[PDB]
Design a protein around this motif. Structure first.
Motif, PDB file in Angstrom:
ATOM      1  N   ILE A   7       0.835  -1.188   0.000  1.00 13.42           N
ATOM      2  CA  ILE A   7       0.000   0.000   0.000  1.00 13.42           C
ATOM      3  C   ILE A   7       0.882   1.256   0.000  1.00 13.42           C
ATOM      4  O   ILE A   7       0.633   2.205  -0.738  1.00 13.42           O
ATOM      5  N   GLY A   8       1.937   1.236   0.810  1.00 15.48           N
ATOM      6  CA  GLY A   8       2.808   2.384   0.932  1.00 15.48           C
ATOM      7  C   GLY A   8       3.495   2.649  -0.381  1.00 15.48           C
ATOM      8  O   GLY A   8       3.601   3.802  -0.827  1.00 15.48           O
ATOM      9  N   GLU A   9       3.927   1.575  -1.032  1.00 18.37           N
ATOM     10  CA  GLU A   9       4.693   1.711  -2.262  1.00 18.37           C
ATOM     11  C   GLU A   9       3.815   2.232  -3.385  1.00 18.37           C
ATOM     12  O   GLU A   9       4.249   3.058  -4.189  1.00 18.37           O
ATOM     13  N   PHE A  10       2.577   1.757  -3.440  1.00 16.63           N
ATOM     14  CA  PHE A  10       1.647   2.239  -4.453  1.00 16.63           C
ATOM     15  C   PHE A  10       1.434   3.740  -4.333  1.00 16.63           C
ATOM     16  O   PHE A  10       1.517   4.491  -5.304  1.00 16.63           O
ATOM     17  N   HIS A  11       1.138   4.166  -3.122  1.00 16.51           N
ATOM     18  CA  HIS A  11       0.888   5.569  -2.878  1.00 16.51           C
ATOM     19  C   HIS A  11       2.121   6.429  -3.065  1.00 16.51           C
ATOM     20  O   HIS A  11       2.009   7.570  -3.497  1.00 16.51           O
ATOM     21  N   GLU A  12       3.295   5.865  -2.803  1.00 18.11           N
ATOM     22  CA  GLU A  12       4.543   6.589  -3.005  1.00 18.11           C
ATOM     23  C   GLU A  12       4.694   6.888  -4.498  1.00 18.11           C
ATOM     24  O   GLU A  12       5.000   8.015  -4.886  1.00 18.11           O
ATOM     25  N   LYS A  13       4.468   5.871  -5.326  1.00 12.09           N
ATOM     26  CA  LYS A  13       4.553   6.009  -6.780  1.00 12.09           C
ATOM     27  C   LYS A  13       3.496   6.980  -7.298  1.00 12.09           C
ATOM     28  O   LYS A  13       3.736   7.765  -8.217  1.00 12.09           O
ATOM     29  N   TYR A  14       2.304   6.903  -6.735  1.00 11.98           N
ATOM     30  CA  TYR A  14       1.237   7.824  -7.143  1.00 11.98           C
ATOM     31  C   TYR A  14       1.696   9.265  -6.875  1.00 11.98           C
ATOM     32  O   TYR A  14       1.695  10.096  -7.778  1.00 11.98           O
ATOM     33  N   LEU A  15       2.122   9.534  -5.642  1.00  9.33           N
ATOM     34  CA  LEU A  15       2.624  10.853  -5.261  1.00  9.33           C
ATOM     35  C   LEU A  15       3.707  11.384  -6.217  1.00  9.33           C
ATOM     36  O   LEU A  15       3.660  12.544  -6.620  1.00  9.33           O
ATOM     37  N   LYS A  16       4.659  10.537  -6.597  1.00  9.95           N
ATOM     38  CA  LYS A  16       5.695  10.945  -7.544  1.00  9.95           C
ATOM     39  C   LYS A  16       5.113  11.290  -8.914  1.00  9.95           C
ATOM     40  O   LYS A  16       5.576  12.217  -9.583  1.00  9.95           O
ATOM     41  N   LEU A  17       4.103  10.546  -9.340  1.00 10.38           N
ATOM     42  CA  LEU A  17       3.475  10.839 -10.618  1.00 10.38           C
ATOM     43  C   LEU A  17       2.809  12.211 -10.587  1.00 10.38           C
ATOM     44  O   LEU A  17       2.806  12.939 -11.577  1.00 10.38           O
ATOM     45  N   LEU A  18       2.248  12.563  -9.439  1.00 11.21           N
ATOM     46  CA  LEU A  18       1.470  13.788  -9.330  1.00 11.21           C
ATOM     47  C   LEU A  18       2.365  15.007  -9.246  1.00 11.21           C
ATOM     48  O   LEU A  18       2.061  16.049  -9.817  1.00 11.21           O
ATOM     49  N   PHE A  19       3.468  14.866  -8.523  1.00 16.95           N
ATOM     50  CA  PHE A  19       4.458  15.922  -8.374  1.00 16.95           C
ATOM     51  C   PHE A  19       5.320  16.119  -9.626  1.00 16.95           C
ATOM     52  O   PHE A  19       6.160  17.020  -9.666  1.00 16.95           O
ATOM     53  N   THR A  20       5.150  15.255 -10.627  1.00 18.74           N
ATOM     54  CA  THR A  20       5.974  15.330 -11.833  1.00 18.74           C
ATOM     55  C   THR A  20       5.602  16.603 -12.621  1.00 18.74           C
ATOM     56  O   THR A  20       4.542  17.196 -12.394  1.00 18.74           O
ATOM     57  N   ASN A  21       6.476  17.021 -13.534  1.00 16.19           N
ATOM     58  CA  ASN A  21       6.406  18.355 -14.148  1.00 16.19           C
ATOM     59  C   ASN A  21       5.494  18.513 -15.374  1.00 16.19           C
ATOM     60  O   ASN A  21       4.723  19.477 -15.456  1.00 16.19           O
ATOM     61  N   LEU A  22       5.631  17.591 -16.329  1.00 19.46           N
ATOM     62  CA  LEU A  22       4.814  17.538 -17.542  1.00 19.46           C
ATOM     63  C   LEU A  22       5.060  18.712 -18.510  1.00 19.46           C
ATOM     64  O   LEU A  22       4.196  19.055 -19.324  1.00 19.46           O
ATOM     65  N   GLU A  23       6.241  19.308 -18.436  1.00 19.77           N
ATOM     66  CA  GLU A  23       6.552  20.459 -19.262  1.00 19.77           C
ATOM     67  C   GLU A  23       6.877  20.087 -20.708  1.00 19.77           C
ATOM     68  O   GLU A  23       6.432  20.751 -21.649  1.00 19.77           O
TER      69      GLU A  23
END
Length: 77
Positions: A7-23
């Motif tokens: 569960i922790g690892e899934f949410h960790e990966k989710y958080l990184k996806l969200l904080f990503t830049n997309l520029e």
């Protein structure tokens, strides 16, 4: 049987996806690939956990991921 580390690892990966830049286009290509792996991982946990908690992983997070996906598809046109 779902561990806290899964569960922790899934949410960790989710958080990184969200904080990503997309520029740049490259970043967006990567984020989209990552979105697909997160949908799969969310549904894996959801099915293994079986409002009941499992519904978040079966339905809600995959829906949010789909939302973010369409948005990223909005930029790259």
């Amino acid at each position: 049987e779902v561990t806290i580390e899964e569960i922790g690892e899934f949410h960790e990966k989710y958080l990184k996806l969200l904080f990503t830049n997309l520029e740049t286009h490259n970043d967006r290509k990567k984020a989209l690939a990552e979105i697909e792996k997160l949908k799969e991982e969310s549904i894996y946990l959801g099915e293994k956990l079986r409002k009941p908690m499992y519904k978040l992983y079966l339905y809600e997070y995959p829906d949010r991921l789909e939302h973010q996906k369409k948005i990223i598809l909005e930029k790259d046109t």
